[PDB]
Design a protein around this ligand. Structure first.
Ligand SMILES: *[C@@H]1O[C@H](CO)[C@@H](O[C@@H]2O[C@H](CO)[C@@H](O[C@@H]3O[C@H](CO[C@H]4O[C@H](CO[C@H]5O[C@H](CO)[C@@H](O)[C@H](O)[C@@H]5O)[C@@H](O)[C@H](O[C@H]5O[C@H](CO)[C@@H](O)[C@H](O)[C@@H]5O)[C@@H]4O)[C@@H](O)[C@H](O[C@H]4O[C@H](CO)[C@@H](O)[C@H](O)[C@@H]4O)[C@@H]3O)[C@H](O)[C@H]2NC(C)=O)[C@H](O)[C@H]1NC(C)=O
Ligand SMILES: *[C@@H]1O[C@H](CO)[C@@H](O[C@@H]2O[C@H](CO)[C@@H](O[C@@H]3O[C@H](CO[C@H]4O[C@H](CO)[C@@H](O)[C@H](O[C@H]5O[C@H](CO)[C@@H](O)[C@H](O)[C@@H]5O)[C@@H]4O)[C@@H](O)[C@H](O[C@H]4O[C@H](CO)[C@@H](O)[C@H](O)[C@@H]4O)[C@@H]3O)[C@H](O)[C@H]2NC(C)=O)[C@H](O)[C@H]1NC(C)=O
Ligand SMILES: *[C@@H]1O[C@H](CO)[C@@H](O[C@@H]2O[C@H](CO)[C@@H](O[C@@H]3O[C@H](CO[C@H]4O[C@H](CO[C@H]5O[C@H](CO)[C@@H](O)[C@H](O)[C@@H]5O)[C@@H](O)[C@H](O[C@H]5O[C@H](CO)[C@@H](O)[C@H](O)[C@@H]5O)[C@@H]4O)[C@@H](O)[C@H](O)[C@@H]3O)[C@H](O)[C@H]2NC(C)=O)[C@H](O)[C@H]1NC(C)=O
Ligand SMILES: *[C@@H]1O[C@H](CO)[C@@H](O[C@@H]2O[C@H](CO)[C@@H](O[C@@H]3O[C@H](CO[C@H]4O[C@H](CO[C@H]5O[C@H](CO)[C@@H](O)[C@H](O)[C@@H]5O)[C@@H](O)[C@H](O[C@H]5O[C@H](CO)[C@@H](O)[C@H](O)[C@@H]5O)[C@@H]4O)[C@@H](O)[C@H](O)[C@@H]3O)[C@H](O)[C@H]2NC(C)=O)[C@H](O)[C@H]1NC(C)=O
Ligand SMILES: *[C@@H]1O[C@H](CO)[C@@H](O)[C@H](O)[C@H]1NC(C)=O
Ligand SMILES: *[C@@H]1O[C@H](CO)[C@@H](O)[C@H](O)[C@H]1NC(C)=O
Ligand SMILES: [Cu+2]
Ligand SMILES: [Cu+2]
Ligand SMILES: [Cu+2]
Ligand SMILES: [Cu+2]
Ligand SMILES: [Cu+2]
Ligand SMILES: [Cu+2]
Ligand SMILES: [Cu+2]
Ligand SMILES: [Cu+2]
Lengths: 500, 500
């Protein structure tokens, strides 16, 4: 691992995570990128050195630290053309931010177009020396982080606008490809009698995974970097950019057990060990687990079963629309672009934050017109995301920057929970077939412009996003910017198209 | 089409339904086999002529007419080693039976080991000249039958015991294969302004399909050959061996529309037009429908939404166990074989029917021991099939020969419907994740031995079956047998193994 003070060299390399060689975007030579680490409260100084040479996967970059509040450091949040202009090749830019009152499992990824699909993605863990769950486990380190990723043989800008499936699933960077009949299996080692805090991170550009480990249950203790009451399940669905920590007790016989991460579309199933890794007990033979009918889950995770470890009052009052500001989002799609309330997000040439600092007076004046929505400061907010056939590609996992939110109503559920709903940062908005109306709440304690979007990267690219201008009046005073940030736009704007 | 009196020549041929050539078992030169037709009440004389030469796909055969009650013609039901010994190559055998009080959508398939997966399967329609639904449609013929098949490039006896997905989905015998990047799309033709009765039949060996037609709803009017009240949906799941008729109104703009049949595992999705066919309006270009994000279903079929067209009483009284005989089935599996109440089905050398005709008094005395269960004559029966992780491969679609049954409790539902539940002959038993306990009722009005088994053919092969000895004492009188049937066993038993 690296961090909390680190260089992250972004470059192009030929890689073969699934046994097929292709050009990718790598971090310190690898994809997925290295584990970034720190402790609760640490100041991070992550110096991103762009050495990219390949315009087809973009020479520029911008890194988002998924899950971090960035209070007073909006300029470091990483959303291209929202929080910064991209870094240009041949240049470095240091993201300097704090894990203020935050600890748990996060990740980092390019937030420039679909570039993270081409490889710029990795896990990020902030340890808590006073973790309230510490007595539940013996091992928590680099080897207990489990990353899931969709991998494509055709590069993001060379294939379909909306890929209809991936070519392999990579678990900790490795996996088998059905289409090329190639690839190796990741091995996750355990020692009988020890308990493990596995930190499961979806780096997916698109599919959700159904994740399980043969012969072992998973005791969930964290969702999207917020501590939960322990809740034991035998499988879970994990959407793009969600995280869970779960305890695994290595109390089964010494053997090899299949770890399964099955995508919702693409190659679904486990023929030849696709969508799989190996949980290997110390002393077990160096072999694959036996070919088996995949086991049936009896206790799959329901989001409605997750509850905050600490009593956390839900903002507003226990009635629909009982907040200061309630907003409903109507989704649509025209075959090319997605729309939220009849607006499709197209990245403005002046980043949203810069427009604000330059003195734009109201959110209606901010570009792109209709996509930037003001929120009043120090207020309770309720957002509803009713699932609709007008926005195909369901279920859409929505993500809000700068905040965690209470999931008052989950997908697949008609209940509203104003008492003890889970807190998270990525939520499935479900399906119109279930008449879903996923509803979330939060407080506007964080001045600045924050992305809200579908975390399916191909949908974001197709404009399925809005930006909240939260506390516009207070944004300049809250977010002083470094000169290096101010220089990004002139440098980027000087590039010819082929050098972007 | 052929029938109700016809020759069916069963042979081996090289075929390429998805553009990859492999050896198969065909019927009158084709797989899937020709449509067999007749009218309600017709006597069928189906002369099965076995010309097979390839032992790898079996030289013997036995054909089951799926959905027919076979009242008094148990010997014609086709279950290998239950209702007959197999037909031997170089011989013929005439299945002579009546569509007595039956009309609707059926199918036929080999019922010897996994031979139907190698190609011996086709649709079978019994028309009703007085169809109570006839005013709802203009066109109902050979061009409105839609068959769905899973297709494998490796033969059933050469591949895994438990395949995890197929190489292609065939709709009306054609489709694209992601394995080989080959195949053509079936075209289903409609004329604007006409209403169509499509008869959708699953000939699947394993996967269930999620079926839909872009831009068109489907008004279900029949399930498993029993008329329903019309019920309109925009997508449906269809399990192995189920049938639905639905009305399609061709009132949309003249164009090409995607027809979708997406398996539950294997290649899931629509990359390059796999799992697809084309609904083509007269006058539309000879072209594919536009590439598209697959549309989201707003009104998927629920089995609990289907009700019999005519008021039909539910056998027994409206309380759990309110029947003459109630039986619960405990499923299990040991890695190789499936078990039902601790017994795995292995075919006996003397067919169960012949054991009965030869004077076996108790179902206790019938072989295989533990797998043959007596049912009292003229009694109300309730069967439950509680889903269990002890039998992986869920959801298991169970099928009962000789009967249709009331689905008092469906998968994915906790309700018991004793008033107007759907009648069918294949039912998904769901998952233990849902606490499913699918429960069915029927009356024992049909003396003879009837298979009850999972219709995933690989699971049947692994023993996931029982046989009901229904009205044992009345069986010989009810089922007089032709000399040709009595000759099958001596002829078959004379074969060397390589000639079977
Ligand atoms: C998914 O869930 C969402 C959320 O529940 C749901 O949308 C709500 O649907 C209900 C029921 O249809 C709506 O209720 C109606 O509202 C009518 C007009 O009220 C308006 O006034 C609101 C102003 O409230 C203040 O405080 C709120 C915070 O609560 C704050 O936002 C405002 O600043 C405001 O000061 C307001 O919320 C609402 O505003 C709109 O929000 C967007 C902005 O993006 C706007 O563009 C939309 O047009 C939306 O309306 C609006 O201005 C009200 O007249 C009506 O009352 C009728 O019916 C009741 C029923 O009993 C009768 O008793 C009564 O006599 C009236 O005839 C009714 O209460 C509610 O407004 C929606 N909420 C939102 C936020 O949009 C979706 O429909 C769900 N979707 C699906 C598919 O299920
Ligand atoms: C910068 O970064 C980009 C993005 O990563 C790099 O882009 C790469 O460009 C190269 C060279 O143009 C690409 O190779 C080509 O791929 C095309 C399209 O391929 C696919 O579709 C085919 C048509 O339907 C299909 O047949 C292919 O499938 C077969 O082949 C693959 C192997 O490629 C095999 O794995 C399968 O089993 C199949 O058998 C495939 O899925 C392809 O048509 C090209 O082949 C033609 O041209 C080559 C040139 O050598 C020629 O030899 C052949 O005869 C053929 O006519 C060619 O292979 C590559 O795919 C791109 N990479 C990605 C990730 O998209 C770019 O190279 C980087 N620049 C630099 C300087 O590094
Ligand atoms: C009586 O009926 C018999 C059954 O129908 C018929 O049997 C045929 O017998 C011939 C002769 O032996 C077979 O042909 C031979 O096939 C083998 C095996 O090849 C196939 O399987 C391999 C392995 O697949 C697995 O592993 C790979 C790699 O890990 C995975 O990708 C895969 O998913 C599996 O897990 C596979 O790689 C092969 O695929 C390659 O080749 C095919 C074309 O052959 C390409 O389409 C494909 O893209 C790929 O390049 C292939 O699927 C092979 O090793 C031999 O070289 C030879 O080809 C027939 O397959 C078999 N037919 C069937 C339907 O099974 C008898 O012939 C018949 N009797 C008579 C007298 O006719
Ligand atoms: C899925 O649904 C299943 C159906 O509801 C359910 O199985 C049922 O479970 C309930 C709740 O525990 C049981 O109820 C308990 O029954 C006993 C009395 O049991 C004995 O008597 C009944 C009635 O016998 C007479 O009537 C029936 C018709 O209703 C005739 O068939 C019978 O011949 C008699 O005339 C009888 O059904 C029981 O049958 C046995 O079944 C097998 C062998 O076939 C045995 O292994 C089993 O243990 C049971 O003994 C039995 O002889 C009573 O003491 C309790 O107070 C309570 O009423 C039901 O018996 C049971 N029904 C059946 C048919 O098994 C599953 O539990 C459910 N599974 C899941 C996971 O949800
Ligand atoms: C996991 O949980 C299920 C349901 O709680 C239980 O039946 C199973 O035995 C457990 N497996 C373990 C502890 O390995
Ligand atoms: C099909 O039914 C749906 C749901 O009832 C409806 O919204 C849609 O307009 C219908 N489409 C047709 C008739 O083409
Ligand atoms: Cu993210
Ligand atoms: Cu984020
Ligand atoms: Cu989306
Ligand atoms: Cu984002
Ligand atoms: Cu059948
Ligand atoms: Cu049958
Ligand atoms: Cu089964
Ligand atoms: Cu059968």
């Amino acid at each position: 691992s690296v961090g909390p003070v680190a260089n992250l060299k972004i470059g192009n390399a030929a890689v073969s995570p699934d046994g097929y060689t292709r050009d990718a975007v790598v971090v310190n030579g690898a994809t997925p990128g290295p584990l970034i680490v720190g402790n609760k409260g640490d100041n991070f100084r992550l110096n991103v050195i762009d050495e990219l040479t390949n315009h087809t996967m973009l020479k520029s970059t911008s890194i988002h630290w998924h899950g971090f509040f960035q209070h007073g450091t909006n300029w470091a949040d990483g959303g291209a053309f929202v929080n910064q202009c991209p870094i240009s090749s041949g240049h470095s830019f240091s993201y300097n931010f704090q894990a203020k009152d935050q600890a748990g499992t996060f990740w980092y990824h390019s937030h420039l177009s679909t570039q993270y699909c081409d490889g710029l993605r990795g896990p990020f863990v902030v340890y808590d020396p006073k973790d309230p769950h510490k007595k539940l486990y013996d091992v928590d380190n680099e080897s207990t982080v489990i990353t899931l990723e969709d991998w494509y043989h055709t590069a993001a800008r060379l294939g379909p606008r909306f890929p209809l499936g991936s070519d392999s699933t990579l678990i900790n960077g490795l996996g088998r490809s059905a289409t090329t009949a190639t690839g190796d299996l990741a091995v996750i080692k355990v020692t009988r009698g020890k308990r493990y805090r596995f930190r499961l991170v979806s780096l997916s550009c698109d599919p959700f995974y159904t994740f399980s480990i043969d012969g072992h249950n998973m005791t969930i203790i964290e969702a999207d970097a917020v501590n939960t009451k322990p809740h034991t399940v035998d499988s879970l669905e994990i959407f793009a950019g969600q995280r869970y920590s779960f305890i695994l007790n290595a109390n089964q016989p010494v053997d090899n057990y299949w770890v399964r991460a099955n995508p919702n579309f693409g190659n679904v199933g486990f023929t030849n060990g696709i969508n799989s890794a190996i949980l290997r007990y110390d002393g077990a033979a160096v072999a694959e687990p036996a070919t088996a009918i995949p086991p049936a889950s009896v206790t799959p995770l329901l989001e409605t079963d997750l509850h905050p470890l600490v009593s956390t009052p839900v903002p507003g009052s226990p009635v629909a629309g009982g907040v200061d500001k309630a907003l409903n989002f109507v989704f649509n799609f025209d075959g090319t672009n997605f729309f939220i309330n009849d607006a499709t997000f197209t990245p403005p040439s002046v980043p949203v934050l810069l427009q604000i600092l330059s003195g734009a007076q109201a959110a209606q004046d901010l570009l792109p017109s209709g996509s930037v929505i003001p929120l009043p400061a120090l207020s309770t907010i309720e957002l509803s995301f009713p699932a609709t056939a007008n926005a195909p590609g369901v279920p859409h996992p929505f993500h809000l920057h700068g905040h965690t939110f209470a999931v008052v109503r989950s997908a697949g559920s008609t209940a509203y929970n104003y008492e003890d709903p889970v807190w998270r940062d990525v939520v499935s908005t479900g399906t119109p077939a279930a008449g879903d109306n996923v509803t979330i709440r939060f407080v506007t304690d964080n001045p600045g412009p924050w992305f809200l979007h579908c975390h399916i990267d191909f949908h974001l690219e197709a404009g399925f996003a809005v930006v909240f201008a939260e506390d516009l009046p207070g944004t300049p005073a809250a977010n002083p910017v470094p000169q290096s940030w101010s220089d990004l736009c002139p440098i980027y704007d000087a590039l010819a198209e082929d050098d972007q």
